[model samples]
Target chain A: GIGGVPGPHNGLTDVPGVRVGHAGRTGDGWLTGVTVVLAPPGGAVAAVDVRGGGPGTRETDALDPRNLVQTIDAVVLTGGSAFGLDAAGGVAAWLEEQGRGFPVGADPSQVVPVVPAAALFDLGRGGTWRARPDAALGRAAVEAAAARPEGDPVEQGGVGAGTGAVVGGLKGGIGTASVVLDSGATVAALAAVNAAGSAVDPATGVLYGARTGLPGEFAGYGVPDAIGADTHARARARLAEAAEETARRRATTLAVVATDATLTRAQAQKLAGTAHDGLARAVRPVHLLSDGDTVFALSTGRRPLLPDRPDATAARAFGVHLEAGALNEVLAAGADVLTRAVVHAVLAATGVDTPGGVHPSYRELYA
Target chain B: GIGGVPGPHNGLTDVPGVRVGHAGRTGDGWLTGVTVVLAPPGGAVAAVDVRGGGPGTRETDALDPRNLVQTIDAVVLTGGSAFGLDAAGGVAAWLEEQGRGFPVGADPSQVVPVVPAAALFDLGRGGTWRARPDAALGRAAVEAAAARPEGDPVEQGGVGAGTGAVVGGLKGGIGTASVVLDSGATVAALAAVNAAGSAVDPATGVLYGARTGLPGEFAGYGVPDAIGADTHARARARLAEAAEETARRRATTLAVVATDATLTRAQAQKLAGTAHDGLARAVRPVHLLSDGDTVFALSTGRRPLLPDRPDATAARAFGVHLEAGALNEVLAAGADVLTRAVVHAVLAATGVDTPGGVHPSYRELYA
Candidate 1:
């Protein structure tokens, strides 16, 4: 009903026989490094959604995932500021060297389907990119995807984009969570904990665990004052300050990758747009200029869809479709599985203490 | 035509009755201040386009100018961080105090509604908020608008949002330029001038002059290297570094306040959106996450509209009914004015020499 119930939370894992594996990096004081989510076996599928005014990366805008011939081999989420874009080239080289990509029509011997990659700002926070995306990390995430877990999945800062990420002047890295719909399906989401607003309880909009001696993971920070000391230096500085201040005017969160059960690319885009609702719910004063604020949805249609065209369906059946439209069938179907996935990313990636302040984990609160 | 027919070289003042004024600050290096654009008196107006995910102040969404509200008094352009949002409150208070705002609904004795404002961010960049929308600044801008210059208007920047502005790693504040359309219409733009990217030359994608052997803008060096230093202690430093590097992954830029002889809100929005194409022409890798790029447009509605609709032949002749479609007539007729507005913002805004490097002025090139 909110932003439309997403279709079944049929994420990339939902793609017929696709698999995903994750190996989260977590530890004390460290808010950087590994949390890789690997796509299915061949890693032969991918897409992109760019909605930020400033985007740094290896953009695959020219590639069309829908085209089976141009399917992506795998996507590597790394931590490095714009400098981290280099990781993409490394991943591409790894995949290309492995001979696991599409065969170049021009050169039958050379099979090279581009390993399109994307990055998030995570420098100076946690994790080092020592030419990572190693075979071990890649294999672990792929294996994890093949296997299922029972409890909440924790990984956030220092995992994906959250690694080396900071929010509202506080240390931040990666955060993930999923919501389960009435159906047994799940819509999973992952955010790189990079935002202007401090991370806090979504409800109270306050930094979590202030009462606890441990760092508070639930709370978030606002824009930092340390950017440009002179303040009145350059025109770009104004834009930079504006970009930072607009955290209230707009949101700082960038791309949110979602896994839907059954939807097309076009539908996925509409679903991605609607997912803004979730952001609106989770972050205060979101969609502000200070926030990169992007969301992407991936459809892995695990359950085969029933063939029911609008004209062929009965009026009663169409009515059901109308009623269900509110529940973004795209995401609602696998809400639980997805929610757990996101939480795992949050917990496994972030630390409890940082220079910006301290952030305690949910475990700290519950324990 | 390419990004629409190339417009003429003119500033915003070329619009029939439109006026502009600036009340800038001086003495302190904090040369920030405010600027205002007063639409012609009693002119029926409409505004249509706006892009979210950027920093914009005092722009009420409801007064879209496309669907409702036909009349508006003035627009105040100001400098301040989001904290400057309070300035809008000041302008509103000023208009109310002046008895130029909405009527006191309860009594026949009061009249109000003198202004609705729009703002661009200008914090530590090039301007200071110490001097805000005061009577002098307000009067200056008002008097300037009333004067109705016959040619190009003087550029406004360090005196406006450009005060505290900086670009790339250097100090850059305020820049303006204008363009003229084949129809002799003009477009004027004034950007607060803050961006992480270099504003030197958009053609080569090179930072105009990132290095210079000078004493520095102040006793301190250019933008401190301190921003990226804190990331190492965090576990996710790699990610944080990546995120900062991703800063280039994103871009930020601003266009001028567009004016066309005639256009509707929707049409204006389209023009504003299309202005992004101009952004593509100038800034490299624009619309990135770290950037809060924006464009604004206003219609002066000076020239009579072009062809009328076919069905309302009787009303078209009556003259008054033709006013209904005048939205399209004026918009189509005056679209060129906006293009000139943008070019002017670029030209006039240029010419400042900073610690980062010297930016040659358009005059230097033209002369």
Candidate 2:
């Protein structure tokens, strides 16, 4: 929205060589699963920013700008708290089978797939305490990616990492958006919106994200007048009553921002930090001590911001300044897409009847 | 060191019912291991502070003040990067065998063990790339704890989680310190020092921690007069030359702070935060982008700062304020112990020659 234009599909897959897939279950004591974001051949320069105090994550150190593994093979986002981190192992297994990873030896299979992962807490919502995403789920998610074509629209609402997602008593799910920069670079993001904060304002019953989106993105959405009188009370009451209960039961919004622009891992990490700015704007009371909000940035390096040819010796400093301004625009767009994605997740999410209770859909309460 | 007297053993074991243990191999291409801090029979009120950008951890969310599992049975500190986190499963397994954990079902063994773990990036330091702490090492660490008596003097230097640890250009290892409070509370800390920063100041050839530690704790230590001319040059050169090389290869200083005082989970987490202050004082350029520095706090609830019964409602609020002052003293002592522990680690460490290269110990260079 702040950069140039929206890509076809308006999703992370809109970036070249990126794929999205989900694996989860809704009934029979299962309401959780994993979301896999597969990178192009040879991986992508990646980094992450973890804003929440309590996070369940794995391999975050591997993505450090100075770490040995500067690139990541894939990133797994899932539900089931710490146990769900096991999903990364399954993703690694699949990558190794395909002979793609950080080469550790001369042999082809002697590679360690660098899969960094993060998880959200959605345990026991489906009536079973131990039910969570496992290695099989991780494998299934990657397999699903292989079956689907790249650049296809990612399904939203109540799937994958958002299967049992709940944000301040409102159902949350997968949301995505993409933007094409003037430099011919594309920035996109996918968010699994499971948060401890409310998405809609109690004062007006309007989604916080709806006001910040593009002109046509939230065109027909608004809180119904009479419905707000009753729904507002219920939503506000649920938010207050469930604050302490859901602090541990439900929290964390995992996201991945990908770009076809060339960037360093440190720059990618900084980009991840900007996405949290988007999160703060879209959700009320974000990055609480009880939450584990995290975001990852992946750079496919398909396009370069600076020219390959030599620059004038005297004007080179100013030339790089221009490059930085362009980079800032790309980063700003990354944040914008994440903000829009959170809104899409809420719009697309469907309500469900569970052992825990029923959580009404946003559409049911608002227009 | 600043707010109270030293505990009997000057180690975390000074806290009643706390135990420490180590398990690892030093030969045959193995140099890394695990350190297990076994809490009291039931558990300890615990929380953690992660200051570094790159961290490898598990089960941190369960310890969130709002989470279900507020207490933890054990904490596993180990080497081996991401793969080392599996050590938590072994610690959990051991707790199950002992029938100690957060009970979920009717059966004793059905309980879930809340064992939070953190790891340092020490992979391949042992010559074998895959040589890392596993489930077996975790089980053995706890087993070693069972064999050792609580309150006994803790073994320091190159062992357990400290094996293969490096700080700047010097060999790093385990360190411990403790203090007895006037409120009858005891506070202690243990640090596995493996920082990307320098512990000793290059200008003076003095350990940064040496000046901040308890007076006599570092009395006999000082850089060798003539050796400083040579060692200083070597240390400074290694630090600069290896910054990029070891950026990913070696980083992270893990610590555990324990107190025999009553504290809420949130309070314990705050206490963990204070320990990082001590880290900054001891290590220059600490919490680097490449480091995964983490600290954990365990409160045994052995001493109470407030009186059992109190009347005078008018003064009740001030009474709690007095309790808070006492709590502040305990936190100050926690920070002091960590500073002294880092010095102890440098003091006790021994030099080593490995396939990667040689890393001289602080004692060898300064004493």
Candidate 3:
């Protein structure tokens, strides 16, 4: 198999029963929207790890192993910082109307849809601060998720939660990637890349992740020619000035890591923690005081854990349960997939110029 | 002599150099706003303890003791949940223009303003989904704070961050309380009381915190005359239906507890954690899965911690430094002040009838 063979379509939907939908608002002073990740009808076991100092989120405590609740109906990623949280209300309302969530009474409608959500700070990116995702946008996102077929190539670049997103001093957007393990289990990631740090090295004028790319991954992109001393000096000066410029540091990176492997709540929590490693590897000065870096991990439990050895029968005879090494593999695959997803977001994004500022895409900057 | 005598004005500004200001927008369909808590010129040692499952915050990680940054320039509490976080950007921009923050290089203008922020969900409460606190509101709040004197009584109820706030089926608002220790150390609390849980008991028609009140505190508001079984049944039914409602639980209670006592970063962090006890005492089912209950503790370090015993010379001779009992007193005082402050918010609030629904005030329900 190709090194770290990606699943068909190589996207988050490769995890069975996982669906993603984006409702983008791209217009003058309105570059913001909502994204929804729908779990299976029965929902999936999920956990989250928040590393950024500043974060906007919803219903995360329910995902804790100690809490009575075990599964979530959906996960929302959106713009508008805390205001985007209203999107979850719409999603929950729609799900409740459709008879979803943990049943509280005899009636099927007597249920509480559990939707955990997080928002990246993207306010004012479109020049007007009034253009933010609302409940209507959230409902639209859910509808989009429901209408789409499974395993379709997940759209990448400026859409959904990443619509107004900026990262690493460049335009950031939504990206997805997936990998099929030897045991037939799959791990995948969806990332909304927006951060206060740079994803590229200033001196080399190279994406930090360029060298980590798989075969044909970063084709046609090579070491950039030096821009000479004056340009370099100007760039450094800009960086220094921006660093000192005090703006509420509305920067964050949001991601969801999912797998088909059967795992316990604690295991899922651990998976979420490891996913941050992928973020750290790809972005510089991550988890800054100004960034709300959050990652979520979910398990569909479709594929049973595989035997540590190739000879399954022999391994089973020894009374060996799901091997610890197998769990490690799944976790490791998550980081790799997540790293690739971040790169894809940067590469796929397109430049957007607004009265507020200009967010140049990776290609716009280098190509 | 009394349990805890409040400072002049009984507001957060009672702490020297601490200032509070608001940028409110209240009209036909706009009932959201921003509140800023400006520290002294130099900043204050700050730490945060987040207990809720869902939180919308900015720049909280920098307050961690493990991190390099020890002080914060300001704290922002605003409406619009995640979108309201944008308010901080405006505040930061203003601070930068004023040449504030940690200095870097030769230029005094080269600084990074550290403004940590949290947003409370108040969308659609104003009968319009678009009414959100933006960057302009943040800037306005900063300007207001700078223009106002520190010792003025803080405006409470239906203003600033509390503008569209609803709690436990009633109008919630802003509240402040302060206590002066026998040692002259001042401890105070400012709470934005918008929670998913009831601040009042339905059956008794009494405030949940009425019992914790000081003498003559809740005198006129004795156990509200029993509303009778039918009325109580209707109230209970309303509560049940509201509980079953599909709105994403975008409810939260954000508070800042300030003390003039000298404290280490870890101690300040601990103070924040202890402050949650007060929230729990006041609001039932707090720190719920849907709530983003966060508390921040700040120290101005103006008043030195006193000894546990009254005998100063003997205590000093015993090498007794800041006593654990003194810390305990401050922590206990925080809970008392916070509990009373929550009740004050409910009591001081006025009803607002909107096309979406009516958020009844305590007076409307009882008086």
Candidate 4:
């Protein structure tokens, strides 16, 4: 909201050559799995931001994974949680099997490939099982690299990392959005929607608006009959929901902004930190403990632009897009639109009908 | 566990003139008071370790709180959730109003007095609404200071922060213990029982032992229904309880350990950060989002020895006394005993008839 405004239609595609793809698996033991972000080799200079305390696996350790001399080749965003950490392993193995890494030894057989990754919890949601990020999802995402055209942003819900994502006790998975600055700089975030708290506002969201059920905890709030569910389940759900909400609320959204200008890692990292501003715009009380929130920044350096101080440029670039000509700067600008995309991603992918009873979707409120 | 062990009989008393006191406020509205830790005026140097996510506060913000330059003079351990943040404010007011702080300005009125304090949630088990931390609790702690003769161990359960505490939905509150190393080093922790997770293995201190309760989401877990009786209370209540269980399951007893050793505020802070190892040793998977976990460390400078050095001696000073045969070896030897004490504090002060529900008592097993 502070910098130069963005153009009329800014999304992730504003960055040149940045490609996104997903492979979703639903149903069965909640085993349905895997999504992918096919980054061009060395195209990603990344940073991570985790808001929740108990994130499942492999985030912190990934920084030094394999200790490559160059920046990471690409980042794998997926599902399967701790087990899904194996998906990265699979990716690593696949990359290793392919000749896609730094040549280590003189013999060339010792080449090592590294893939840093993050995952969203998608097991509990009621979706089809066996939809893993096996060969098919991996290849499709890889092949889709050719079709990576600039256009309307991809609606990132019920797909990719978002598949099986849950929030507000509803199904949740992945949510993605890109913010376009007035000067054309773009920042994008993709979040997996598995939280320990609520995604839907019990007081106003469509989920609550259409539901007849109200747990007793809200009896005083007028949402009576809110039957007490499992405290651990509810708490756990809320923790995740809270973490995500807090991240988004606190601005739980995670992203990577790339502009034509050059910036150092620290500057880029700070840029990612400023994304917290974006997260704050989306979620309430962002960055609570119940959240395993994190943010990542990637600089593709594909766009050609004038140089200025990194912060100044970022502020200017982000400010423009936020202030873009719109009916609702607070609610309809690119950043706002991106934020909604993230929120919708969580709601769209989530499928209820677990533990007990089912929660309706936002679409249900349409009627 | 690795380094920074305590000497024989390593109770919190190891620190010169460091005393803890509690005013057990009980009756209806879950009226539980506060626990006060009075450091001997200005000699104590301290730091805090926050492992939990949902931390309630006042003291945490001011790692450095007074003009005295001696770190914290006292820490308030109370029994309310976020609302309990008010209690810390009360302590600050009391300390300031009394002219206890080192005045900052030439004009006496212009100088600001500060008191850094932390709180725990204890309103779960319904109790008296009239209860509040009065000057009495502070006075009792001060009085207990002089009465703390050598060899006296800190009290646990229904005392201090553990007052009106609950864990595992059986009946719990405060728990405390001291670990004495062979070399005369010591460490102590007093846990306030108010987690939304289970404190003990309701089945037998075996299955869920430390990781009591169910998980909240893919990232972490929470207290089981058997432990989290009702969920109709405030959101903070469930959050606090959940944080406790997170600490229990993920880490270990929280405490403030002190030594006569000389260390700067930064060094002391570093030591506290490292002391997270102790939490790691005593508890399982610690530092989770659901945990409002915290650990404070102080250097009372009671003993006269060694100057600063980044050498092995400094490293060796860690976990000094597990056997207690020598002075610095006290903490390590007493680790087991201290673990018991800290756990006891959580069990003894909890109850179901109160606002939240009853937590199991450690006495049932040890007795």
| TM-score of each model, in listed order | 0.40, 0.50, 0.49, 0.43
Model 2, span A143-171: residue lDDT tens: 88877776788888899999988876777
Q: Write the per-residue lDDT of candidate 1 for residues B1-367, one digit (tens) a residue.
A: 1122323323455554666556665444344455656566564354423332345555546446444454455665555545544544555555555445546577633755535444444443222234334445555555555566544455553455454444443333444434444334445444545554334343222222211111121122123322232322331333234335433332234444555456666556545544443332233223332345555566676643343334433222113444433332223223223323323333344444322223333323221
| Docking model 1 quality class | incorrect
DockQ of each: 0.02, 0.02, 0.01, 0.02
Candidate 2 chain B: minimum summed lDDT over ten consecutive residues — where? B310-319
Q: Which ten residues in a row have the lowest lDDT in candidate 3 chain B?
A: B313-322
Higher lDDT: candidate 2 or 3? 2
lDDT of 4 by residue, B76-105 (tens): 666665565455554555556555565688
**Model 1, backbone clash pairs (residues 3+ apart or across chains), number:** 230
User: What do the candidate models score in CA lDDT, each in turn?
Assistant: 0.42, 0.79, 0.77, 0.46
What's the ranking of the predictions by lDDT, best on top?
A: 2, 3, 4, 1
lDDT of 3 at A235: 54
> In order, how many clashes per candidate?
230, 0, 9, 186
Give the Å shift of residue A272 in candidate 3: 19
* Candidate 2 stretches greater than 4 Å from native: A1-367, B1-3, B220-231, B234-251, B307-320
- Indicate the worst ten consecutive residues by lDDT in candidate 2 chain A: A310-319
Instruction: Chain A TM-score per model, please list them.
Output: 0.59, 0.90, 0.89, 0.65
Q: Pick the candidate with the highest TM-score.
A: 2
* Model 3 accuracy (lDDT, Cα): 0.77
Q: Which stretches of candidate 1 lie over 4 Å from their true place?
A: A1-367, B1-9, B48-56, B65-67, B93-121, B125-140, B147-152, B169-190, B200-256, B304-367
Instruction: Give DockQ: model 3.
Output: 0.01
